[PDB]
Amino acid sequence: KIHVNPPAEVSTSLKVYQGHTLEKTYMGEDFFWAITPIAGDYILFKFDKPVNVESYLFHSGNQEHPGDILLNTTVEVLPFKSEGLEISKETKDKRLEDGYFRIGKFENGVAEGMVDPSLNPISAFRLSVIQNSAVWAILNEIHIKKAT
């Protein structure tokens, strides 16, 4: 699908297969196709400006290769403000050492979810590969939706 995502510098540690780069998927042009993701691989969307994020949608696999999905991969967000924000005990528990919050993860090839209003606006979205994959990973759709 084609969405207008917030302007961003987009990068990955992953090796892509035959031109299937992350920037084209972010732009709606083609699907991302990574060779066998390993623990500690990431996909990074670093926004040019802070974004008030309502929700996110990542769909892995596609019609032609439906088992080429993202497994054991988390959804992490970097708040623009590092301090000056009360957050709940539950939300503090999701804070990583590098200051990203772990808000979600891939379940049967899909990650979709709301952003806690207390974390907005956001400077970056990251997808962290926590464990090794046997399968290649397609990203067919990326939608980061603005709340404002």
Side-chain angles (χ1 to χ4, degrees):
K1 299 285 170 203
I2 307 147
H3 313 278
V4 182
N5 291 304
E9 173 208 325
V10 313
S11 53
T12 188
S13 61
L14 294 163
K15 171 145 217 218
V16 301
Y17 186 63
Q18 287 202 12
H20 285 266
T21 63
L22 175 63
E23 311 93 83
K24 295 171 184 182
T25 314
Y26 196 71
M27 292 324 217
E29 305 214 314
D30 210 339
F31 69 89
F32 180 67
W33 209 357
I35 291 144
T36 66
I38 59 170
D41 274 319
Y42 63 95
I43 300 173
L44 178 60
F45 317 95
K46 179 185 214 211
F47 307 128
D48 300 350
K49 310 181 164 162
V51 188
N52 270 348
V53 178
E54 195 177 50
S55 66
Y56 59 94
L57 172 50
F58 312 89
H59 178 92
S60 75
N62 74 4
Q63 200 178 194
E64 292 81 45
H65 322 274
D68 284 38
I69 56 166
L70 269 176
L71 296 167
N72 299 304
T73 294
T74 53
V75 180
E76 304 164 343
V77 301
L78 185 56
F80 179 62
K81 292 177 165 198
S82 40
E83 301 301 350
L85 67 182
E86 193 185 24
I87 286 159
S88 61
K89 157 47 150 108
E90 284 96 341
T91 300
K92 278 172 170 286
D93 284 351
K94 291 172 172 151
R95 197 198 145 95
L96 298 176
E97 272 181 39
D98 60 14
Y100 280 77
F101 291 76
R102 202 167 275 168
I103 60 160
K105 69 182 176 188
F106 278 89
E107 287 161 16
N108 316 289
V110 171
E112 84 195 10
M114 309 288 289
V115 178
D116 196 318
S118 65
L119 296 183
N120 267 322
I122 286 157
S123 298
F125 255 78
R126 186 175 64 198
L127 315 180
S128 296
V129 182
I130 309 306
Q131 315 189 343
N132 296 343
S133 186
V135 307
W136 294 24
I138 289 164
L139 221 45
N140 207 39
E141 190 187 20
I142 298 162
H143 190 190
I144 298 165
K145 199 189 173 221
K146 292 176 164 177
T148 58

